[PDB]
Amino acid sequence: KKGYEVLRDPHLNKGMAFTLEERQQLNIHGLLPPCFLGQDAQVYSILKNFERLTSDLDRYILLMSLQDRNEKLFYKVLTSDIERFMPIVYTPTVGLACQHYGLAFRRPRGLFITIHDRGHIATMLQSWPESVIKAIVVTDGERILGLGDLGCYGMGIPVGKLALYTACGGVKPHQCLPVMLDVGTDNETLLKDPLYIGLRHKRIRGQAYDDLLDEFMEAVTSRYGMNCLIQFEDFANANAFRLLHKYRNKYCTFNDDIQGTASVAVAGLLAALRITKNRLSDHTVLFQGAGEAALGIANLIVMAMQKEGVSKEEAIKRIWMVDSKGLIVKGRASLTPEKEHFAHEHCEMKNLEDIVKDIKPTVLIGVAAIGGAFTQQILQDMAAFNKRPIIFALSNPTSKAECTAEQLYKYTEGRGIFASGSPFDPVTLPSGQTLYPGQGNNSYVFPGVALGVISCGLKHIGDDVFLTTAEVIAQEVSEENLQEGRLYPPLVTIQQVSLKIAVRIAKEAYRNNTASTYPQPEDLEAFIRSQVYSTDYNCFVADSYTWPEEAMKVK
Amino acid sequence: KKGYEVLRDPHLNKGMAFTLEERQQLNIHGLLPPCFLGQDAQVYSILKNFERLTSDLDRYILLMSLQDRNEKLFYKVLTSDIERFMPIVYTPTVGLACQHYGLAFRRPRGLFITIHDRGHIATMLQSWPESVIKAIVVTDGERILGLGDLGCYGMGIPVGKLALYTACGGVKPHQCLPVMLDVGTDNETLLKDPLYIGLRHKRIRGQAYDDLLDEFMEAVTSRYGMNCLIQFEDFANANAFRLLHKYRNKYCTFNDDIQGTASVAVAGLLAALRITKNRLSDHTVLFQGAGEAALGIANLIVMAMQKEGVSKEEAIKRIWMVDSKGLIVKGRASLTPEKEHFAHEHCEMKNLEDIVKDIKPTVLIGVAAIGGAFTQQILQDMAAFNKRPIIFALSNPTSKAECTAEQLYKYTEGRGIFASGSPFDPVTLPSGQTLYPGQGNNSYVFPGVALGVISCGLKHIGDDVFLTTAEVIAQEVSEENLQEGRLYPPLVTIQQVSLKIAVRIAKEAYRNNTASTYPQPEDLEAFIRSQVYSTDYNCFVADSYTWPEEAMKVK
Amino acid sequence: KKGYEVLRDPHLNKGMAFTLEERQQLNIHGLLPPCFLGQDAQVYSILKNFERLTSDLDRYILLMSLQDRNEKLFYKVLTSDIERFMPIVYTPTVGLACQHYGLAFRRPRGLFITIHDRGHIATMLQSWPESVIKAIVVTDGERILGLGDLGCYGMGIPVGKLALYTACGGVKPHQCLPVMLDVGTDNETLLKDPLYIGLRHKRIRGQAYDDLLDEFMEAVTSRYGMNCLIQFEDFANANAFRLLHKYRNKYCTFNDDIQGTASVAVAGLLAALRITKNRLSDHTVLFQGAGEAALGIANLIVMAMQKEGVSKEEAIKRIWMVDSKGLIVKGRASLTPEKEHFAHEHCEMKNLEDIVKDIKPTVLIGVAAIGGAFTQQILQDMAAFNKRPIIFALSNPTSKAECTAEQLYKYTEGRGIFASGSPFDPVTLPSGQTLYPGQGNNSYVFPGVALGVISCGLKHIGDDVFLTTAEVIAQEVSEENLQEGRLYPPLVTIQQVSLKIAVRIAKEAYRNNTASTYPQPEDLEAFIRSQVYSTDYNCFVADSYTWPEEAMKVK
Amino acid sequence: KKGYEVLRDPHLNKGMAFTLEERQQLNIHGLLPPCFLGQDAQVYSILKNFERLTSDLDRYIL
Numbered sequence A, B, C: 001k002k003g004y005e006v007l008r009d010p011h012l013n014k015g016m017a018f019t020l021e022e023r024q025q026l027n028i029h030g031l032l033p034p035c036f037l038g039q040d041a042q043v044y045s046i047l048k049n050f051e052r053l054t055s056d057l058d059r060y061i062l063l064m065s066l067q068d069r070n071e072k073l074f075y076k077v078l079t080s081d082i083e084r085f086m087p088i089v090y091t092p093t094v095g096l097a098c099q100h101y102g103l104a105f106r107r108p109r110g111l112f113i114t115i116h117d118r119g120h121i122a123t124m125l126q127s128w129p130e131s132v133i134k135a136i137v138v139t140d141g142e143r144i145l146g147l148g149d150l151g152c153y154g155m156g157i158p159v160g161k162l163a164l165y166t167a168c169g170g171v172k173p174h175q176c177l178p179v180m181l182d183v184g185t186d187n188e189t190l191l192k193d194p195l196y197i198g199l200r201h202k203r204i205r206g207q208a209y210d211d212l213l214d215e216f217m218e219a220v221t222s223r224y225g226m227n228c229l230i231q232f233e234d235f236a237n238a239n240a241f242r243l244l245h246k247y248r249n250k251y252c253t254f255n256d257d258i259q260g261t262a263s264v265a266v267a268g269l270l271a272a273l274r275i276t277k278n279r280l281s282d283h284t285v286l287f288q289g290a291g292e293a294a295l296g297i298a299n300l301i302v303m304a305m306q307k308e309g310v311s312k313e314e315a316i317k318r319i320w321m322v323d324s325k326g327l328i329v330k331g332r333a334s335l336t337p338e339k340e341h342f343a344h345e346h347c348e349m350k351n352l353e354d355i356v357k358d359i360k361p362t363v364l365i366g367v368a369a370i371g372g373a374f375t376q377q378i379l380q381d382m383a384a385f386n387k388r389p390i391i392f393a394l395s396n397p398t399s400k401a402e403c404t405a406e407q408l409y410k411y412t413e414g415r416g417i418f419a420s421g422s423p424f425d426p427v428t429l430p431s432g433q434t435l436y437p438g439q440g441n442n443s444y445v446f447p448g449v450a451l452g453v454i455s456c457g458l459k460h461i462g463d464d465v466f467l468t469t470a471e472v473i474a475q476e477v478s479e480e481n482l483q484e485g486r487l488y489p490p491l492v493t494i495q496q497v498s499l500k501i502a503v504r505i506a507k508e509a510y511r512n513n514t515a516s517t518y519p520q521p522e523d524l525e526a527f528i529r530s531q532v533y534s535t536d537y538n539c540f541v542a543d544s545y546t547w548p549e550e551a552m553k554v555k
Numbered sequence D: 001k002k003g004y005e006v007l008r009d010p011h012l013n014k015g016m017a018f019t020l021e022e023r024q025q026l027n028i029h030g031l032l033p034p035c036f037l038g039q040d041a042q043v044y045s046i047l048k049n050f051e052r053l054t055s056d057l058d059r060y061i062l
């Protein structure tokens, strides 16, 4: 393609990086100022623009616009200082963006499918420029992080997730599709908000909702193929599980919040074991929350424990859960079949601190979006019953973190092992030792899992894929990392980590013959490495070459 | 047109204003959130976005992006509150933008022709999406406002002018082309500036430059037609004049800085006469500056006086000028033929205040871009020998204004009649009366002159056109306006004033047979009104309708 | 798509079959006369146009132009009377077309890859509008039917083959790509021909040629996938066999001339056995020719005989061949490894008639492109030592057929069982009985084999596929068919036969796990039927529908 | 503009008169046979096609 149409297509636009000869051939010479530069120069300019801003939202908006203008440059900047820009494009800033999505909105991104478009989804996929999609992150916006129902403002998440698909996983941008399934919203505040971009009516539930979802899945895989990876993100509890169970074995799909979190959670405990000097089956885990994350994580912990040689029954007995009504115990009221799995014989309790004192767990996991649930008392108690207690404040965004790295280390005398879903700066204990709290976030799992699935075309994703991936991650945590308090490999190495996760997933796929990409590559690492996205700009010059002169003569 | 490419075309893009039916027919249903809204709603969000910003530079980028995303919306927002947004799109903010163009740069706009493209201009015009252009604003960036040589960063100016072409004149945006002729820059600072977007070398002068200009004019008129309007803007002294004289009679062109300024300046004096209760031939004008603006304004003033009944010779004797070397007197050194035209018998002088006290003028016009040249002294002196002195601080941007509205009104005890190139807020005198200083800026002239020339196809623009336009503008100043201290009709009525300027120019054109649009309209006003740009969106639904039924049958 | 561009795209163009509403929405209303018609009406006008022509070459051109104008209409016409149009679009007219390709040329069709394009094939595949190709028919034009080296004029063959892919097989036209690999031509006549459209130089051979082919296969499968079907057609002997052997197990490819012909020839023998009332192992085959067709057929026959219980050695003993040097016997000079395979101990012989009298075969197959090789004497001899001799004049086009249907039936006194590569009209014997000579032509094999490979994605095509296909075809020959003298099912049922061929190929592909399309359909016949091409026009009206009214409300 | 779309537009289409370089830049190299001819060589082939016709209506259609 050519002309000014190129400058408006972010997948093609190189900006002033366009060569004098490229510009001339593309019929755009004169539409750009008379200066030519490389990505480094362009990155410089962006940083000057980023530096001068004075609000995270403004930084977000700046980057989102870059993403809408020059694809390569966007990712070049992202990967240039992942630790610096991820907090803007992903948690916690992405939640802030979703809260003001109507305000931050500029150019649309993604595919918005409505409950009112039932029976016409197949047609709408046509509207999407790309005809070859290999991955999709979808949400209905009912459980945006620990922020609740943000309706159509929730589109910010899929966009963020996919940003890492490329930035941290190497998955090509052009093959991914962020999707919003707006069936309404129960958030009264949004329904009254003048800037709200979604349907102004309560969420439609029941059979209608279910049929919408079936059509979506059927339509996507029909157009893009049965190998298309569908990643559910931030759906409400009930919907999340039923949908997973319903499609898990029918399509190539998985739920990030349920399975991706479990993977990273276990990856941290597996790593923590090298500090606590014991076996996972010697621990006693207590969850604040009993939803998607808790239930997903708890299940993976059990599989991990059985792998150690313990029985399924013994493993489940070491896992305790607390929901909005209190400690989940046998015979308690308001219990679900899934919760009943961890209902143990015990009197009922409501106060979290009393529960911590009673259960005396070795691992405290926070996944209930409850502010500073992990108070100094709770933290002190953990430091009291444990030589080195493991503390996981997983709720996102930052404002929902069960506790801070600072407080964790402060109230546990620097003996607590910490991890959180949202980023925290390093902490220098009184002893002068600087600890670097790790980020237990999906971000360590979904990019590699995607690179993997897409690479070998794994037909379906079993729970073993996440357990194995939890091991691959932990295997990348160095002794040096561990000594700094890191339960995960440094973020700057995320790409390398993703590759390994991808290669490992491929090896298993072919082994169990669940793969689809054939013939099988003689060297999987080499093959996947060659399938990864490249930050470099392509050359838009026509492929000119000469023929012998006799054969090229004009008659 | 078609699909997503529609959403990237600002001339077409309607954003969420596209109807469900339009989106479905345009193959973009799904690419936009599930909410449909009108322009009012769209303007609201834009304002909430403009409101939260905290820098003029930022507000500029905001609007500029808007213009790159939704044409109709952009202009709907500007005219919604011209007095509020013009300062952002035009003076003085536009000057600040030019100073930091490299930084503010996002998406390119306009046509950038280089000195190294000599012999290829014709082809480059093709790279421009539009093949039908009626107006063109060119600059080489050597004299950007009173900011000097800003090289390629000067592109911001033609874009500003054109913005007003539409917003103030009603000229259709799609038919206008902003152009930057980059032949280098002598600004050592820019040459070292890492963000500079132009050619990194001193300006090329001599015959190479002249050939480039001739080619440009030729290229532009051959492609777009002889009737194409070429507006020269912000060129250096020497070039501005010779280029104007060189193409004046050959093509449809004029120089905004020399002729447009002259027109508005005369319009103001004509209005002031109704406060000073005398005739223009009764005044004595003193110009701080003897450049493009000064010489142009002086020339029109002379014509205006002669039209009163005074002789050429007598008129000239009433104009005094001061340049970098001091008062322009007969037999002084460093004099140009143009300047020696106003060189009177008198002793040399350099001190401005002493010059004011010696010549004792009734009107003081500042056009030398000298900060606060009109000091307390000067202003007091003026209010001393003049019952009601006329003070014109025309230099731009604000930072160059010879003096402020507050200063003028205070140091002239409220008896001074003020006007300036850049905007100043209302002033409330100690007497309790609030004055609304007018803005003597080209903006009152070029929009209407363009509407006029384009509408009737006036082959060439003579000085009479600007004198007539000056009378037209003054004619629209009401007694009420005068009573408030306005030498110009309120800015909120600028569209109507442009209409009358256009209608007038048309009538003259047909009378003198210099028009080209035939047959001549019976009602010039009605004709022009129907030629004006509309801010309303068009409907993108296919024009569907039925034929009988026997004729519509399928055989 | 939209606009006049639609009318020029044969894959979209519906002609006057475009609905008024379609024309209005596609922006073509007014570009077509004021009448709307159905396909039947359109076919009628085509037939009127075909009727008035007076030459086969002109009928060819008419139909080729139809194909370049309206795709569906083209195939609608072909399938409306396959027995009438196939002889025009295929053998023998296609051979005539190729001989005058330069003269018949109008609009180009297919992909022309030259030997001078080595190292740039991948680039050239981009030039091709479709990015999703599933089948390709390639030729270098060195052995076009029995007409020899027709160089670039040979493009007519791949175009013809693919015409039947769709017409007889049901394969989608847009997913197929006809390719010509021009490396020159040794035909002195064409080099001198002023209308020749290929490279005017002797064919390039050796390593250069082999590298071009490797690059071709690599580029095609890299861009279109390893499952892309590559059908080699009309390559010279040496090149045909080595290319087949070299890529056979590496890509999804087969050689129509060697393998397709084998399949159809055995299909006919299988059917013939039901007339001769005996087993294949009871016959003695004699081939007039020892090349691509001869060796391929000979090979399939052997496999067929072994499946009856006979050993490989015993089977080979029943097959004799004659080449340009005469009867192929042990120790004979100028023999090939492949030929030596059938070199039996026997005295050398050169005269075909004498050879027939000596070997006394029960099956006479002609594949040497030798005019009327099967003389009256030979035909009489065959009817002398065989109650019911089986005569196959497989050489194409008709002017190369070993003998005519009339001649065969006349000189065998109506006892000879006939079949030919090119069509012959029914024959009414003196007894009054009318026989319908069958057509033993690849056309019975490649369409169905293609529909099958493409459908289930069979990685590689082994000879078993052709042997089973032969059985599938013979299975479709009814008792009635046989009684009329038909060795193959009637042409009018070819689409039904192809389907059966495909469903069987699929079944075995999944059984042997050599398929690629997964999950496997529960009903293969139903799946494949749903994938077949539809001759009906699509509806180009936008998918319009409404949402509730509150959700459609414009703010 | 470019691509096979150019071959279909009679105002732009040059047939085999398109140069090797033109074809490569227009993204149509390969859509035309490996032969380059001038207008007169093209006229010649038109005349041969005209000559063999035997009806004015056919010559009209050609």
Ligand SMILES: NC(=O)c1ccc[n+]([C@@H]2O[C@H](COP(=O)([O-])OP(=O)(O)OC[C@H]3O[C@@H](n4cnc5c(N)ncnc54)[C@H](OP(=O)(O)O)[C@@H]3O)[C@@H](O)[C@H]2O)c1
Pocket: A143, A144, A145, A146, A147, A236, A237, A256, A257, A258, A260, A261, A264, A288, A289, A290, A291, A292, A293, A294, A322, A323, A324, A325, A326, A366, A367, A368, A369, A370, A394, A395, A396, A397, A400, A420, A421, A422, A440, A441, A442, A443
């Ligand atoms: N990688 C990561 O770091 C990651 C990944 C996914 C999710 N998360 C975070 O985890 C949080 C929840 O996600 P989810 O998917 O698990 O949501 P969910 O399914 O809604 O689960 C939330 C749970 O918290 C419980 N809860 C509410 N108030 C409580 C209270 N006062 N005391 C104890 N428990 C209480 C709820 O109880 P009931 O059962 O009574 O309703 C519910 O079971 C979010 O903030 C999210 O951002 C982090």
Ligand SMILES: NC(=O)c1ccc[n+]([C@@H]2O[C@H](COP(=O)([O-])OP(=O)(O)OC[C@H]3O[C@@H](n4cnc5c(N)ncnc54)[C@H](OP(=O)(O)O)[C@@H]3O)[C@@H](O)[C@H]2O)c1
Pocket: B143, B145, B146, B147, B236, B237, B256, B257, B258, B260, B261, B264, B288, B289, B290, B291, B292, B293, B294, B322, B323, B324, B325, B326, B366, B367, B368, B369, B370, B394, B395, B396, B397, B400, B420, B421, B422, B440, B441, B442, B443
């Ligand atoms: N509509 C409007 O409000 C409008 C329109 C056009 C221009 N302007 C303003 O007018 C200003 C100049 O524009 P221009 O085109 O006339 O520029 P120009 O051609 O550069 O002329 C500037 C003149 O000022 C003289 N000068 C410089 N310093 C002086 C000093 N210290 N004391 C006395 N005279 C001095 C120069 O003298 P020499 O000849 O000796 O060098 C020169 O004649 C700009 O700031 C611009 O913003 C306003």
Ligand SMILES: NC(=O)c1ccc[n+]([C@@H]2O[C@H](COP(=O)([O-])OP(=O)(O)OC[C@H]3O[C@@H](n4cnc5c(N)ncnc54)[C@H](OP(=O)(O)O)[C@@H]3O)[C@@H](O)[C@H]2O)c1
Pocket: C143, C145, C146, C147, C236, C237, C256, C257, C258, C260, C261, C264, C288, C289, C290, C291, C292, C293, C294, C322, C323, C324, C325, C366, C367, C368, C369, C370, C394, C395, C396, C397, C400, C420, C421, C422, C440, C441, C442, C443
């Ligand atoms: N589906 C169909 O019905 C179908 C498909 C493919 C081909 N065919 C036809 O089969 C014929 C041959 O094609 P091919 O691909 O097999 O070509 P090929 O590989 O060149 O084989 C031709 C063979 O005929 C031999 N020959 C030449 N003159 C002979 C003569 N006077 N007496 C006996 N044998 C002679 C040649 O012998 P040497 O080796 O000594 O040179 C050669 O072995 C063509 O006319 C073609 O149209 C029909």
Ligand SMILES: O=C([O-])C(=O)[O-]
Pocket: A091, A144, A145, A146, A234, A256, A257, A395, A396, A397, A421, A441, A442
């Ligand atoms: O749900 C979340 O909070 C996440 O995935 O980071």
Ligand SMILES: O=C([O-])C(=O)[O-]
Pocket: B144, B145, B146, B234, B256, B257, B395, B396, B397, B421, B441, B442
């Ligand atoms: O030059 C200027 O400042 C203008 O034209 O307003």
Ligand SMILES: O=C([O-])C(=O)[O-]
Pocket: C144, C145, C146, C234, C256, C257, C395, C396, C421, C441, C442
């Ligand atoms: O080459 C041939 O003769 C054929 O394919 O039928």
Ligand SMILES: [Cl-]
Pocket: A014, A015, A016, A017, A042
């Ligand atoms: Cl850039």
Ligand SMILES: [Cl-]
Pocket: C055, C056, C057, C058, C096
């Ligand atoms: Cl013919």
Ligand SMILES: [Cl-]
Pocket: C399
């Ligand atoms: Cl012949």
Ligand SMILES: [Cl-]
Pocket: C489, C490, C491, C492
């Ligand atoms: Cl038949």
Ligand SMILES: [Cl-]
Pocket: C039, C535, C536, C537
């Ligand atoms: Cl139809």
Ligand SMILES: [Mn+2]
Pocket: A145, A233, A234, A256, A257
């Ligand atoms: Mn999530």
Ligand SMILES: [Mn+2]
Pocket: B145, B233, B234, B256, B257
């Ligand atoms: Mn200016």
Ligand SMILES: [Mn+2]
Pocket: C145, C233, C234, C256, C257
């Ligand atoms: Mn063939």
Ligand code: NA
Pocket: C050, C051, C052, C053, C054, C059
């Ligand atoms: Na006919």
Ligand code: NA
Pocket: C064, C109, C155, C156, C159
């Ligand atoms: Na053809």
